[PDB]
């Protein structure tokens, strides 16, 4: 049986972080899976178009950022750009 990967483990971790005494239903978790896969495809697609427009063959963190700014509305874009920058600086700091 071929494995069917998903984001449910990670969605559950970030769920127990925000509301530690709150569970989630199978259907609701499925909606969360579709949400993460969806946003993933939107971001990576806008970044693909971005790299193609500027004749670059590499998708870097910068294209992901510009894609976030193009895709997410105002405040979500600001906080998402913040957390992304923080994550890549912490990553490269090692």
């Amino acid at each position: 049986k071929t494995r069917k990967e998903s984001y449910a483990i990670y969605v559950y971790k970030v769920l127990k972080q925000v509301h530690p005494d709150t569970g989630i239903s199978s259907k609701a978790m499925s909606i969360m899976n579709s949400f993460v896969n969806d946003v993933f495809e939107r971001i990576a697609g806008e970044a693909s178009r971005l790299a193609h427009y500027n004749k670059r063959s590499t998708i870097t963190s910068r294209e992901i950022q510009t894609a976030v700014r193009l895709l997410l509305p105002g405040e979500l874009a600001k906080h998402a750009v913040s957390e992304g920058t923080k994550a890549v600086t912490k990553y490269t700091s090692a």
């Binding site: 990967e5 984001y7 990670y10 969605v11 971790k13 970030v14 769920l15 972080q17 925000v18 509301h19 005494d21 709150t22 569970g23 989630i24 239903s25 259907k27 609701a28 909606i31 969360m32 949400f35 993460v36 969806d38 946003v39 993933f40 495809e41 971001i43 990576a44 697609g45 970044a47 693909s48 790299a51 193609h52 670059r56 063959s57 590499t58 998708i59 870097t60 963190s61 294209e63 992901i64 950022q65 976030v68 997410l72 509305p73 105002g74 405040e75 979500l76 906080h79 998402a80 957390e83 992304g84 920058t85 923080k86 994550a87 890549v88 912490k90 990553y91 490269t92 090692a94």
Partner: protein, 106 residues
């Protein structure tokens, strides 16, 4: 040590990387792109799960169901705009009656 721990994230950096090259969005994928993308995805999940958990608490429930995800999405202007062309299965609709449809003057 995983790259997720290396970046201070719960979401899988390695999986986001392998998916980024598996979906041929470009020829090459820098090392920071899956870190940034997993970070953004994790932030969005944290946001919607916060608003939805509050929706479940308001309805005196301890388990989030699609109704709570819908209430969270459609009541947050930014999340609603982000999912403007998306329908959440079993999400229902926001209670909203146009004021003219309400009775008046006995």
């Amino acid at each position: 040590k995983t790259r997720s721990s290396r970046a201070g994230l719960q979401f899988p950096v390695g999986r986001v990387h392998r998916l980024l090259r598996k979906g041929n969005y470009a020829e090459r994928v820098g090392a920071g792109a899956p870190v940034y993308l997993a970070a953004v995805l994790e932030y969005l999940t944290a946001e919607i799960l916060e608003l939805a958990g509050n929706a479940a608490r308001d309805n005196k429930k301890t388990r989030i169901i699609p109704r709570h995800l819908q209430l969270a999405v459609r009541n947050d202007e930014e999340l609603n705009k982000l999912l403007g062309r998306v329908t959440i299965a079993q999400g229902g609709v926001l209670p909203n009656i146009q004021s003219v449809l309400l009775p008046k003057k006995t």
